[PDB]
Design an enzyme around this catalytic site. Structure first.
Site, PDB file in Angstrom:
ATOM      1  N   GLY A  19       0.807  -1.063  -0.229  1.00 39.53           N
ATOM      2  CA  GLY A  19       0.062  -0.103  -0.032  1.00 39.53           C
ATOM      3  C   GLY A  19       0.823   1.238  -0.027  1.00 39.53           C
ATOM      4  O   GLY A  19       2.175   1.409   0.104  1.00 39.53           O
ATOM      5  N   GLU A  24      -3.066   0.517  -3.723  1.00 42.12           N
ATOM      6  CA  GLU A  24      -3.049  -0.628  -3.425  1.00 42.12           C
ATOM      7  C   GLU A  24      -2.322  -1.735  -4.343  1.00 42.12           C
ATOM      8  O   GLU A  24      -2.500  -1.357  -5.501  1.00 42.12           O
ATOM      9  CB  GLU A  24      -4.199  -1.335  -2.973  1.00 42.12           C
ATOM     10  CG  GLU A  24      -4.791  -0.542  -1.923  1.00 42.12           C
ATOM     11  CD  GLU A  24      -4.474  -0.682  -0.353  1.00 42.12           C
ATOM     12  OE1 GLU A  24      -3.440  -1.295  -0.246  1.00 42.12           O
ATOM     13  OE2 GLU A  24      -5.225  -0.391   0.482  1.00 42.12           O
ATOM     14  N   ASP A 131      14.118   7.543 -10.654  1.00 40.01           N
ATOM     15  CA  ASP A 131      13.820   6.811  -9.358  1.00 40.01           C
ATOM     16  C   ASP A 131      14.226   5.682  -9.257  1.00 40.01           C
ATOM     17  O   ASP A 131      13.915   4.608  -8.539  1.00 40.01           O
ATOM     18  CB  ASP A 131      12.046   6.640  -9.490  1.00 40.01           C
ATOM     19  CG  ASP A 131      11.289   7.881  -9.098  1.00 40.01           C
ATOM     20  OD1 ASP A 131      11.823   8.771  -8.458  1.00 40.01           O
ATOM     21  OD2 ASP A 131      10.267   7.878  -9.789  1.00 40.01           O
TER      22      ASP A 131
END
Ligand SMILES: COc1cccc(F)c1-c1cc2c(cn1)cnn2-c1cccc(N2CCN(C)CC2)n1
Length: 288
Positions: A19, A24, A131
């Site tokens: 989560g 989710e 990232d």
């Protein structure tokens, strides 16, 4: 490939994996084929519209490479967007090393090669990932390496907005990224720096300066004499591994090697780098 229907029409959910603010993530099974997939659920806001969604979803389908988690389809149902994707059953490298301890040099070399292949693809498409870190690199049950997505620009709607608003944790960030307001700007070679940090993370279980407050780290990256980090243990690692870290963590982006150049580095071009090294890591995880 946006269906306006319940994803449960096509998939049996099996387990809730994780989560966040994004939403989710679930392990699911295709009801026809029996193949495992990951399903990512994000809540739709009243602000969000299907015209901007289709374009964002189209790019997910087209930005395709073996070392990036494959997109299968999307479902819009009861103000929730479900993205269906290739299943990477061992989780992230962070999930793995937090259990196994530090990766072997060969395991790190294989991971770096695979990530660099993904980066070389993304950079060829003029995309900056932004990232790269252990938490965003996934491993499947065959020991293959997959970037969770093509990076910051893969994010949709409000999650993308948050990613622009807050730079987030700086430990994997190139100094030129950290200092973008103050010095001159950045380019795709920031991902190469991030990969260098990631190699240390896999070696040492955290990036350099992880115990320093993130605002303090961000601040230090602004100053002229920020020193690139190094591996803590001298004798553990080969000359090739130390050199890989040195070159990926070149301070000047002008002098920092490209993804394709890094793929010619001794560390990642040596023979015997294959998924079997990660199968051994997963066998270690299962049978400590
Ligand atoms: C870093 O991966 C994400 C981050 C945010 C949102 C996501 F949907 C993902 C994500 C996870 C994915 C895939 C695509 N994306 C594909 N397989 N798979 C997967 C499968 C099994 C276990 C597992 N985890 C990784 C995350 N830890 C925290 C729990 C276990 N992940």
């Amino acid at each position: 490939d946006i269906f306006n229907r319940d994803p449960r029409d096509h998939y049996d959910l099996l387990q809730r994996l994780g989560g966040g603010t994004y939403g989710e993530v679930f392990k699911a099974r295709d009801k026809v084929s029996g193949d495992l997939v990951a399903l990512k659920m994000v809540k739709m806001e009243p602000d969000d519209d299907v015209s901007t969604l289709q374009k964002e979803i189209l790019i997910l389908k087209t930005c395709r490479h073996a070392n990036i988690v494959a997109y299968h389809g999307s479902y819009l149902w009861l103000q929730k967007l479900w993205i269906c994707m290739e299943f990477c059953g061992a989780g992230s490298l962070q999930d793995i090393y937090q259990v196994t301890g530090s990766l072997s040099e060969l395991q790190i070399s294989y991971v770096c090669r695979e990530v660099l292949q993904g980066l070389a693809y993304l950079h060829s498409q003029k995309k900056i990932h932004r990232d790269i870190k252990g938490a965003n690199i996934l491993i499947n049950d065959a020991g293959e390496v997959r970037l969770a997505d093509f990076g910051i620009s893969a994010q949709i709607g409000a999650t993308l907005a948050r990613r622009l608003a807050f730079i987030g944790t700086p430990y994997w960030m190139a100094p030129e990224v950290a200092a973008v307001a103050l010095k001159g700007c950045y380019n795709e070679l920031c991902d190469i720096w991030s990969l260098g940090i990631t190699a240390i993370e896999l070696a040492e279980l955290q990036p350099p300066l992880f115990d320093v407050h993130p605002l303090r780290v961000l601040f230090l990256m602004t100053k002229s004499g920020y020193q690139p980090p190094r591996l803590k243990e001298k004798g553990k690692w080969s000359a090739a591994f130390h050199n890989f870290i040195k070159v990926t963590l070149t301070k000047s982006p002008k002098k920092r090697p490209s993804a394709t150049k890094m793929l010619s580095h001794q560390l990642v071009s040596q023979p015997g780098l294959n998924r079997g090294l990660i199968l051994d890591l997963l066998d270690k995880l299962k049978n400590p």
